[PDB]
Design a protein around this nucleic acid. Structure first.
Length: 551
DNA sequence: TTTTTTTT
């Protein structure tokens, strides 16, 4: 599988690292060197080596800025960037063209040609088929990365078959027994699964998705069914298991992921009569496709999530599409006890577009500016009683009110110190509360006990290797995204106009829902009014349409 | 303009 000497030498001769040379060859085969001699921008499609790398080498050797191969590849990059920076599955043709202008600063005619060339070469796909509603009316087709279009169609297809075929080997029945503990709405989930292969369960914080899910697990297994429980993250999986009293795992591990791909698929389905997936709000199309591809013929799937939480980082909104297309139980009654909680109340206000009624011993905001703000947040945390007592959250990593700068100040306030060992950003010193960023697993807090030159020991108990140093950062403050699935008694949420592009309803909702007992904000009240008012950035996705053209 | 789930 290794590279022939002169192949490698030549590839490095174009400015590629060894790793890049390996990726190129995996992608192209032996004539990789010939392909990149003919078209260096052919690198745009190789995972790990993008357009940006192709462009740096290209300009480095005085290659023409308006060379059609660059422009063609810029068309592809526009779509790649659409998915990357905003989760789109496609762009209307005029936006794809605009994408190219924006980046390459060529004329519209040059950009139109670049999109046209990409399509006729099959580096991009064009679809203008009406479906249910779109492309013929607005007179503009959708441009996709080819695999994304194939993937969106396949997903809708699996979903369609799942909706349209009843569960079978069937002897699923719902004894009055199994309904105990559950309300009318919750119990219904058990009924719904008697007749249907695909069922969605949604609802917010105080609605009882956990008991409801456990009850599904219980009933199924009493019927002899083999039940697979999973979630998109390690932490989420760990929690599912905890509340279910069972072994729950990552969607990747459940589907037998490895370097060789997903082990489970249509050829070797996941051996489970029922799949329970929690936190589906975090799932993009690609992973949903992988999961559903692995569902045995006739087998069941329960998808559970909260549609008001942050959308997936990856492209698509499949839980949102499915919530509109599948049998879905939307749980709404809040537990009378938890009906009182000022935070639960402020969270529900967000859903009607209102910012929270600040001015309470358990829910209040302190107005601050970005200048010195971080230092101030540290003093606030001290007022609330130290970082053991409060978790700091923020929309962004970067900038004055962001995670890196907030950790820096927190450390300085509570753990002043000279010489630590360097990690993701900054350095770890004994007494530091750090966060594991990679899968034991990602998201988990801890406590540093000691360091050395380039060696680090923290607590569970283990050391820290030079490559592992990259997979660790200070934990006193986290991004709202990183805090997904986790909960604390008291959280200090930083939110301000300085976080402008992140100010949406879903972001503030997730943040608010991280707090069990108390939630204090630092920033501006106006920043909350914006977030409450503003829906999350729109995503281009034709999945719902496809499921419904099908039906 | 921003966030960043996954493995043997």
């Amino acid at each position: 599988q290794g590279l022939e000497r002169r192949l490698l030498a030549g590839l490095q001769g174009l400015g590629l690292t060894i790793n890049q040379a390996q990726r190129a060859v995996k992608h192209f085969g032996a004539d990789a060197l010939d392909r990149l001699e003919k078209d260096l921008f052919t690198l745009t499609e190789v995972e790990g080596i993008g357009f940006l790398t192709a462009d740096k080498l290209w300009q480095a050797r005085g290659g023409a800025l308006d060379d059609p191969r660059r422009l063609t590849a810029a068309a592809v990059y526009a779509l790649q960037l659409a998915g990357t920076q905003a989760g789109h599955s496609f762009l209307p043709r005029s936006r794809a063209e605009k994408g190219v202008v924006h980046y390459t600063r060529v004329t519209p005619g040059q950009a139109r040609l670049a999109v046209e060339t990409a399509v006729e070469l099959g580096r991009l796909s064009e679809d203008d088929s009406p479906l249910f509603a779109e492309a013929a009316a607005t007179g503009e087709g959708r441009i996709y990365l080819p695999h994304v279009l194939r993937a969106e169609k396949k997903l809708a297809s699996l979903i369609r078959t799942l909706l349209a075929t009843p569960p079978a080997d069937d002897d699923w029945a719902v004894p009055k027994k199994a309904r105990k503990g559950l309300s009318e709405e919750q119990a219904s989930v058990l009924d719904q699964l008697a007749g249907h292969r695909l069922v969605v369960l949604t609802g917010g914080p105080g609605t009882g998705k956990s008991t409801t899910t456990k009850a599904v697990a219980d009933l199924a297994e009493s019927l002899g069914l083999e039940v697979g429980l999973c979630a998109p993250t390690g932490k989420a999986a760990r929690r599912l298991g905890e509340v279910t009293g069972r072994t729950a795992s990552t969607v990747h591990r459940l589907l037998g992921y490895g370097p060789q791909g997903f082990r489970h698929n249509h050829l070797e389905p996941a051996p489970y009569d029922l799949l329970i997936v929690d936190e589906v709000s975090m799932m993009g199309d690609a992973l949903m496709l992988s999961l559903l591809a692995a569902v045995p013929p006739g087998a069941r799937v329960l998808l559970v999530g909260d549609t008001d939480q942050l959308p997936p980082v990856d492209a698509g909104l499949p839980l949102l599409a499915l919530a509109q297309a599948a049998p879905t139980i939307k749980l709404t009654q809040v537990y009378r006890q938890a009906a009182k909680n000022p935070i639960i109340q402020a969270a529900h206000g967000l859903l009607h577009g209102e910012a929270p009624a600040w001015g309470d011993k358990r829910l209040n905001l302190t107005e601050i500016e970005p200048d010195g703000g971080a230092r101030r947040v540290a003093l606030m945390v001290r007022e609330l009683g130290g970082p053991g007592a409060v978790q700091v959250l923020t929309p962004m990593r970067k900038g004055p009110l962001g995670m890196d700068h907030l950790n820096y100040h927190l450390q300085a306030l509570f753990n002043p110190g000279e010489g630590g060992v360097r990690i993701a950003e900054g350095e770890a010193r004994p007494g530091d509360t750090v966060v594991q960023t990679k899968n034991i697993f990602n998201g988990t807090l801890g406590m540093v006990l000691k360091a050395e030159g380039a060696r680090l020991t923290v607590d569970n108990v283990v050391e820290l290797t030079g490559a592992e140093l990259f997979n660790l950062q200070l934990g006193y403050a986290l991004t709202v995204h990183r805090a997904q699935g986790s909960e604390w008694g008291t959280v200090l949420g930083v939110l301000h106009e300085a976080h402008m592009p992140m100010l949406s309803r879903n972001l503030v909702y997730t943040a608010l829902t991280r707090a069990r007992d108390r939630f204090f904000s630092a920033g501006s009240a106006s920043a909350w009014q914006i977030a409450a008012a503003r829906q999350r950035e729109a995503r281009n996705t034709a999945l719902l349409e496809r499921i419904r053209a099908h039906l």
